[PDB]
Amino acid sequence: QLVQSGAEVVKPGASVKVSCKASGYTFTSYWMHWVKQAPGQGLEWIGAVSPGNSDTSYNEKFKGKATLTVDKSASTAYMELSSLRSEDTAVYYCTRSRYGNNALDYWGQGTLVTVSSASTKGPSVFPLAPSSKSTSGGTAALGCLVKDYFPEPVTVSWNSGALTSGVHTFPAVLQSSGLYSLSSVVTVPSSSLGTQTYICNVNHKPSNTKVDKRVEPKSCD
Amino acid sequence: QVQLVQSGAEVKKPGSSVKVSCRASGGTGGTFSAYAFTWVRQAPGQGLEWMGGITGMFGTANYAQKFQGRVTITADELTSTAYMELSSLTSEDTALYYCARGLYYYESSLDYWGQGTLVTVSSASTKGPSVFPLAPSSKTAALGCLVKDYFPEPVTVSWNSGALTSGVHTFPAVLQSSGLYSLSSVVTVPSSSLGTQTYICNVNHKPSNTKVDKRVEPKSC
Amino acid sequence: DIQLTQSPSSLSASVGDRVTITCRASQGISSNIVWLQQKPGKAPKGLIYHGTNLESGVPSRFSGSGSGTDYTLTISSLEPEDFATYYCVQYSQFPPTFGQGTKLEIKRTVAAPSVFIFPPSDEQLKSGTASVVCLLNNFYPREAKVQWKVDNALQSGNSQESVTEQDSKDSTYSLSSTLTLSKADYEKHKVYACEVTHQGLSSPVTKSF
Amino acid sequence: EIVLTQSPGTLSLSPGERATLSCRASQSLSSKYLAWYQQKPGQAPRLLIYGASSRATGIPDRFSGSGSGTDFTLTISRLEPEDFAVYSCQQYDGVPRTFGQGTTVEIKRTVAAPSVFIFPPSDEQLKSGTASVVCLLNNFYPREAKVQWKVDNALQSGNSQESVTEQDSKDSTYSLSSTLTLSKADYEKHKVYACEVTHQGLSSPVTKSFNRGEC
Numbered sequence: 001q002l003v004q005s006g007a008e009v010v011k012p013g014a015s016v017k018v019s020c021k022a023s024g025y026t027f028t029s030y031w032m033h034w035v036k037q038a039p040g041q042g043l044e045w046i047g048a049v050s051p052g053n054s055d056t057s058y059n060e061k062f063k064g065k066a067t068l069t070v071d072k073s074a075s076t077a078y079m080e081l082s083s084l085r086s087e088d089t090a091v092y093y094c095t096r097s098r099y100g101n102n103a104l105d106y107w108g109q110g111t112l113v114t115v116s117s118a119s120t121k122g123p124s125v126f127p128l129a130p131s132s133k134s135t136s137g138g139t140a141a142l143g144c145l146v147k148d149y150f151p152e153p154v155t156v157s158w159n160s161g162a163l164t165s166g167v168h169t170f171p172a173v174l175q176s177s178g179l180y181s182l183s184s185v186v187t188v189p190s191s192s193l194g195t196q197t198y199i200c201n202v203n204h205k206p207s208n209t210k211v212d213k214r215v216e217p218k219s220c221d
Numbered sequence: 222q223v224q225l226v227q228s229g230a231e232v233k234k235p236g237s238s239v240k241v242s243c244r245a246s247g248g249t250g251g252t253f254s255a256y257a258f259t260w261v262r263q264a265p266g267q268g269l270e271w272m273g274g275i276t277g278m279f280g281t282a283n284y285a286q287k288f289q290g291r292v293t294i295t296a297d298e299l300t301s302t303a304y305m306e307l308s309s310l311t312s313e314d315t316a317l318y319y320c321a322r323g324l325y326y327y328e329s330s331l332d333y334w335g336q337g338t339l340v341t342v343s344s345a346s347t348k349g350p351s352v353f354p355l356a357p358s359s360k361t362a363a364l365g366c367l368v369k370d371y372f373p374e375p376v377t378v379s380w381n382s383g384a385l386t387s388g389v390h391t392f393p394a395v396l397q398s399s400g401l402y403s404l405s406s407v408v409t410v411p412s413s414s415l416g417t418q419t420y421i422c423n424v425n426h427k428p429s430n431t432k433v434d435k436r437v438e439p440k441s442c
Numbered sequence: 443d444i445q446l447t448q449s450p451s452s453l454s455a456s457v458g459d460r461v462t463i464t465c466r467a468s469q470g471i472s473s474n475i476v477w478l479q480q481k482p483g484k485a486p487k488g489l490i491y492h493g494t495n496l497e498s499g500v501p502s503r504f505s506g507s508g509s510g511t512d513y514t515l516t517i518s519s520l521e522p523e524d525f526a527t528y529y530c531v532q533y534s535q536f537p538p539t540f541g542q543g544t545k546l547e548i549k550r551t552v553a554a555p556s557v558f559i560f561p562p563s564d565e566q567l568k569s570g571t572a573s574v575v576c577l578l579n580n581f582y583p584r585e586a587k588v589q590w591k592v593d594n595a596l597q598s599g600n601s602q603e604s605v606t607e608q609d610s611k612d613s614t615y616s617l618s619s620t621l622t623l624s625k626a627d628y629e630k631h632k633v634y635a636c637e638v639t640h641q642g643l644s645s646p647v648t649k650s651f
Numbered sequence: 652e653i654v655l656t657q658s659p660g661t662l663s664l665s666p667g668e669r670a671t672l673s674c675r676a677s678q679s680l681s682s683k684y685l686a687w688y689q690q691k692p693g694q695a696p697r698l699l700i701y702g703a704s705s706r707a708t709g710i711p712d713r714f715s716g717s718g719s720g721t722d723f724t725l726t727i728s729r730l731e732p733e734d735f736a737v738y739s740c741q742q743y744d745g746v747p748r749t750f751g752q753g754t755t756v757e758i759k760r761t762v763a764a765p766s767v768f769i770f771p772p773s774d775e776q777l778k779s780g781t782a783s784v785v786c787l788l789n790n791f792y793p794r795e796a797k798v799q800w801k802v803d804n805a806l807q808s809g810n811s812q813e814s815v816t817e818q819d820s821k822d823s824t825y826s827l828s829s830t831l832t833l834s835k836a837d838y839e840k841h842k843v844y845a846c847e848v849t850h851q852g853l854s855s856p857v858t859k860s861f862n863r864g865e866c
Contacts, residue, residue, distance in 0.1 A: 043540035105488035330701035
């Protein structure tokens with residue numbers, strides 16, 4: 001199979017070297033390929049390298065942005081992305097082909113490369129308060145707006161496991177300012193909206209920000 | 222010094238099939254699997270014609286719809302040999318077949334060529350030539366030999382065991398309705414040497430080990 | 443570049459159904475086509491190579507066919523494991539190119555969204571910006587239109603949408619459109635609508651505060 | 652399909668002259684995808700130019716290419732003897748890859764008229780079922796020649812074949828042979844066998860003939 005290096009957050013002009021360890025097959029019987037996947041252009045072929053004699057082929061679109069090399073010893077391929085921009089933000093995959101034959105059968109698990117001027121910031125959990133009314137009988141809904149954090153991920157739980165149900169912790173969104181927002185939501189019975197205590201258990205490992213926050217009706221205009 | 226060596230000429234009966242090979246020698250040959258190997262042919266009277274090629278990295282073929290199914294193009298990474306197989310042969314596949322190669326895994330310009338393989342297609346059977354005199358009329362004079370009904374070619378014709386060289390034209394062969402070849406060799410000579418000088422043409426047809434010598438001299442008159 | 447076009451872009455079906463996805467290349471590609479499967483979060487897996495050949499491991503309900511410009515992948519009886527996105531990739535010519543995907547989702551019986559709106563919390567407004575969040579909960583199909591209205595005026599270009607994957611129980615969806623404004627621009631104000639249109643709604647339900 | 656057409660069919664120029672060869676694509680062609688090849692007799696094609704205007708490594712610089720869109724040009728600034736050969740363009744933008752019909756570059760020289768001779772079929776060939784009448788046209792220029800067979804002044808059609816030698820290495824000339832093939836039966840049913848030649852080196856058509864019955 002194919003195991004790649006971990007995710008990476010880096011700043012604009014910088015450069016990254018991603019790795020892919022082949023194991024369990026003859027490293028040199030396969031050309032190793034690199035593929036970009038990001039919302040915008042979808043799936044794109046960056047290029048490929050033959051491990052034997054290190055022959056390369058690059059997509060004109062990535063010509064120069066990327067440089068592929070290989071270590072036959074370690075059965076490993078490397079991709080180097082240079083002169084980075086925020087548009088190069090993507091998941092990058094390695095995969096293989098066999099000259100015979102097949103395919104693009106096995107893919108690496110992918111390496112997330114995030115490119116942002118923005119520097120590390122913690123969230124700002126704000127309460128989405130349950131309104132007085134009504135709705136169509138039951139039930140009632142409340143949540144936390146996890147606003148302005150960098151970079152992903154954040155983990156939001158509710159009552160730490162005592163609320164694995166009815167909960168929707170949405171995907172993030174990158175605002176202008178280059179900062180992410182997230183909103184979690186739970187749906188609770190219209191009756192006990194003042195019998196149970198709901199605290200957002202947001203933690204954001206990229207800094208050491210673990211925030212608790214409870215949510216209640218406020219009673220003003 | 223990219224070198225491409227193709228298999229030798231073949232003569233095939235209609236309905237049969239021919240597999241031409243192409244072996245990538247060469248000191249700057251490089252990774253055989255990195256380059257697209259292309260097959261093209263040239264029928265007598267026609268332009269060069271693309272048949273298909275096999276891509277590098279991936280080692281799979283693309284075909285001209287004209288030959289889709291009829292042609293198969295494969296490659297043997299082990300022996301650095303590319304092959305083209307054309308079946309259901311017709312007399313119109315009589316042609317020189319060529320493997321070629323460039324600098325990339327996909328086909329582009331054709332930088333390197335094999336020496337070409339001639340494939341003749343015919344329902345004929347090996348047959349040495351009958352020779353008849355082309356007697357000088359009387360009436361500078363001309364004379365010659367009709368080299369008639371042979372298969373396959375070449376025939377080689379000389380005069381006075383190679384003594385007579387100048388003023389000699391041996392024509393290309395023509396293929397008659399009878400699937401067999403006819404040809405002529407002529408020589409122009411002094412009128413005043415039509416009685417003094419002996420003239421013999423020397424027909425050699427290796428595909429039948431048939432050497433023939435024929436005396437050419439005036440008729441009666 | 444060869445353009446690959448998949449049909450349909452999205453497809454809804456149920457366990458047991460024979461399903462067919464298609465791919466049209468902008469020129470003849472001689473069966474040099476691969477089909478991929480990708481579940482969300484995860485990496486692609488090759489299913490079919492060179493038009494018709496199964497990858498090892500790949501269960502046999504999967505099969506591909508086609509020639510020239512037109513190819514189809516066919517799942518003969520869908521399994522719960524088979525709901526994913528599918529891609530064709532072409533390697534007839536340089537560079538290899540990818541289709542944009544056919545997402546294969548689960549079919550269930552409509553069911554309409556429950557709507558909930560939330561004004562900004564009070565600590566937020568102390569600082570520069572006001573963030574108002576509308577929620578649409580557990581609906582189907584995915585199609586849904588969310589339109590804010592401030593003092594009954596339709597606004598454009600300062601809301602962000604965000605949808606969940608298909609719930610593991612409900613097979614429904616959920617949606618979060620947030621409208622963001624500075625505290626100053628925020629106070630016109632209080633009539634703040636969240637008008638939502640949907641297929642299981644007789645009429646655009648609105649929530650305001 | 653990108654169709655490529657080449658002009659002219661034959662270019663007739665002298666050693667040292669500038670050769671201009673054209674290649675027309677049936678539709679606009681990014682010049683990144685056009686190539687020219689030289690085909691010397693007996694030899695596999697030789698890539699001269701790729702990408703419309705880049706000279707292949709180890710190619711004399713008297714060769715050059717230009718053009719964009721639909722018309723491309725291969726220029727040979729000064730013809731050396733070895734450049735008298737056939738040239739083909741190639742497109743490698745789309746599928747199928749296609750070539751033009753090729754242009755033959757040929758040596759121009761002064762007009763020289765053919766010597767014509769007519770040979771009657773042998774009696775040896777005639778005891779077998781077939782009579783072959785051969786007409787020779789020796790050492791002429793240019794290559795166009797019309798040879799007409801008349802059997803008792805009956806314009807023949809479909810029963811002759813002809814063959815032309817290559818342009819001569821010494822005197823840049825051509826020779827041609829026309830063979831008329833009849834059965835011994837058809838041969839002995841007529842008396843006058845005529846070979847008439849029209850060539851621009853000839854003020855008036857030359858005829859050579861024989862009567863069946865010289866023995």
